[PDB]
């Protein structure tokens, strides 16, 4: 249809549960990357025909790819930039997952048409947001914020900024459309070449040497996010990836509990960038990925550009705003909504917690106050006790999720003040 999705709407972040990753043949990525992806995750390869599917299968077979995780969509495409032209995922109507199409900002009509085939393959509804856009210039935090470079306005110049924001609100639930002047000074003007949310409370911003002409622009961008309160209420943790030679270190893919980071030398500088991700994202497997010689990584175009995560149409979604830092008390009550997009019975919903850093985490069942709305109150705590906690839910479709996604390795932390 030509109507927007039934609300409420919530755009899905890249670090939420993904059912798959979407890539295209003829390839722009190394076979070793496809192999590593398919070890743990479903890889959907776009091909133009049944014969082309079988050509790809032959190559996957030769390369030892886990075929059990290889799936295909038959559709014409102009390019391998699946980041930029495939559809955007959003929850809508409380418990549904939908796809949002847009006008691809390139003269690539097959790429532009592609989202309809994606929605058909996935069995989800598609909604048409009439803005000139590109996935490389889009990221959301999963809490209603999105960051884009200025082309989101300038390539939609027949609309006011207000009208652009309103389209993002209506189709994606974006209530904070953070559009900023691109700090990189190159043609492409995609956020994925300088910035990346790593979690709702973490953003990676590119850094360059002091004498690079964009040094100050990037420092100003880092400062802007560091001054900003995030969805969870704390200031963003701002991480920096140092590009000494225009390496595309921000152009990474977060797929479930792994992070694929393009690397292109020198080795020490690549390792420094991997180390930033490792520090920022405990519990994640951080993987450096060398480029293919025929389609190498570039400053403006690397791994993120040539992949697109795919949401789970049956997503078991946990909505939670954490209690963090110095908390007054005397009640320490957490609240979470849990929605099963599989329409499955949810049970159990638990708080896993640890007090003062010792032993194992302990499970307590949360109490369902009203439909889909769960709470839990931390009892018996003394002034200055430190709490680590995370939420865990399961449903009878077999799904199991934690909040945060990674769970126990990176729990929410607060301190009981009793004041
Ligand atoms: N998400 C990205 N960084 N995409 C890079 C796209 C590169 C391609 N040459 C273009 O300008 O269309
Ligand atoms: Na499109």
Author numbering: 47 to 465
Give me lines lifted from the publication on this model.
An equivalent mutant construct (tPPADC351A) with the essential catalytic nucleophile among GMEs Cys35126 substituted to Ala, is catalytically inactive. We have determined the 1.46 Å and 1.48 Å structures of tPPADWT and tPPADC351A by molecular replacement, which reveal identical and superimposable conformations (root mean square deviation (RMSD)∼0.09 Å), suggesting that the Cys351Ala substitution did not perturb protein integrity. Difference Fourier electron density maps clearly reveal an active site-bound ligand, modelled in the tPPADC351A structure as an arginine-containing dipeptide, and in the tPPADWT structure as an amidino adduct where its Cζ atom is covalently linked to the Cys351 S atom. The tPPADC351A structure captures an intact arginine side chain without enzymatic turnover, mimicking the enzyme-substrate Michaelis complex prior to catalysis. At the end of the cavity, the site of the PPAD citrullination reaction, both ligands are coordinated by five polar residues strictly conserved among GMEs, namely Asp130, His236, Asp238, Asn297 and Cys351/Ala351. Located away from the site of nucleophilic attack, Arg152 and Arg154 form ionic bonds with the free carboxyl group of a C-terminal arginine, stabilising the substrate for enzymatic turnover. Citrullination activity of tPPADWT on FibA-R was significantly higher than FibA-R-XX (p=0.003), the latter equivalent to the baseline measurement level for inactive tPPADC351A. The crystallised tPPADWT and tPPADC351A constructs include residues aa464–484, with no visible electron density. This region represents a flexible linker connecting the IgLF and CTD in the full-length polypeptide, and its flexibility likely caused disorder in the crystal.
